[PDB]
Symmetry: C3
Subunit: 175 residues, 3 copies
């Protein structure tokens, strides 16, 4: 079965979404969901010795300006395996242009890890952690010759609006 | 393809069963099989710094008193990845009540690891290892406020009888 | 969805194939894709404290003399997870007889790791690394009492010809 096409975007959209993880925190391999088969695929190995600072994946049944599902970053203490579904609370959004495409990314925490119970907005995240995520996306494709721009961070309300936008984009793209 | 519904309980029931592993030994993340989609889901992160002492999963095409497939614990030297099928020999059964529900769990060894060839019954397991498993289930929900009660251990025959019961409970629930 | 039957052998066969990895480098557990159900299965735990020296898997929609899809070994710096697709460039082939069956294995590198951009043929691989792979296959079944023979290595052209053979064997076996 196809997790991208057959799983709803979330159980309580947009307050709680499903994050389908592709890349566990700590990986240098850039795994992606193969949208046609539903299997994991190695898109590439990052060209620099950088690792994903968050569990990285997609919101099911979303689409975005770069021709892929909406990107979601989940803060997990123990990383999950690829293709794991996490119930995630959006708390903010990273504003990124990637190679000329809008490619903003939801920042979210797991609903079912009580460690994060008081993380509800972008102001709850350590500043250095936001900077480390932004810096990763600012530099990780430098050796690929691709231009990226990190514009800053939006709050949970802006993230939730963008989730609704991406959900609608999927419905327009796939009928 | 849903392995819970579409895979038989075992190749030589109840002497050899299939264990579909959800949680590798050493995990604090409580992964589960999503019984509808067949994907792995993060049910929760354990509230305490405890780790699963066994590879933990389900027997396909079983059902149990707590509204879930029959739980199986497989002793693996190297943990397997989530959603791996193991041919497993039941050697005993942990007698547990969980939140008022019977929730006994098969203890089994992999047929195809020769290290365990002489493990055939509950008396073959080091006492401290049985105690460590029981203690995990005695305390792992304490910060969730959910009562568990470990009554003791049954032998391989009692485990095999319970497997047959759980197989019949699935046919009744889903037949 | 059965990856063995429903994934194509590659995007540019035989220059680039898909490797569907079953066993990450470093594993002692011998994971296998079940050919009928598409689920990952533990076939066995290796009887000796050896680990797979390569990411190990199959080329989809192939068939081979041992009654199984064609085995492929991918050199990955960071191992992948079981059931991951890798776009792989064949660079050589290990000539192995296993329990009386021809069971040669493609050696390949990931197209999308620039570390391997200049690895194009068997002469690009450190000799000690080829020896370590051959030695693994020479001894990993010794405690199972199963005879293997490692005859040597073939080059990228021979590997590609054998991939084409295995693709045609699949079509013949499965009526495609
Ligand atoms: Ca993406
Ligand atoms: Ca991007
Ligand atoms: Ca993107
Ligand atoms: Ca269970
Ligand atoms: Ca329970
Ligand atoms: Ca249970
Ligand atoms: Ca094989
Ligand atoms: Ca073989
Ligand atoms: Ca083979
Ligand atoms: Na085999």
């Amino acid at each position: 079965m196809n997790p991208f096409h057959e799983l709803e975007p979330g159980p309580e959209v947009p307050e709680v979404v499903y994050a389908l993880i592709e890349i566990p925190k700590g990986s240098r391999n850039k795994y992606e969901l193969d949208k046609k088969t539903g299997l994991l695929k190695l898109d590439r190995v990052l060209y620099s010795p950088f690792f994903y600072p968050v569990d990285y994946g997609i919101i099911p049944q979303t689409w975005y300006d770069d021709g892929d599902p909406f990107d979601i970053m989940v803060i997990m203490r123990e990383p999950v395996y690829p293709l794991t579904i996490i119930e995630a609370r959006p708390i903010g959004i990273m504003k990124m242009e990637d190679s000329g495409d809008k490619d903003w990314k939801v920042l979210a925490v797991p609903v079912e890890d009580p460690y994060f119970n008081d993380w509800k907005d972008i102001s709850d995240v350590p500043k250095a952690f936001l900077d480390e995520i932004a810096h990763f996306f600012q530099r990780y494709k430098e050796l690929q010759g691709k231009t990226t721009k990190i514009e800053g961070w939006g709050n949970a309300e802006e993230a939730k609006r963008e989730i609704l936008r991406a959900i609608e984009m999927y419905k327009e793209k796939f009928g």
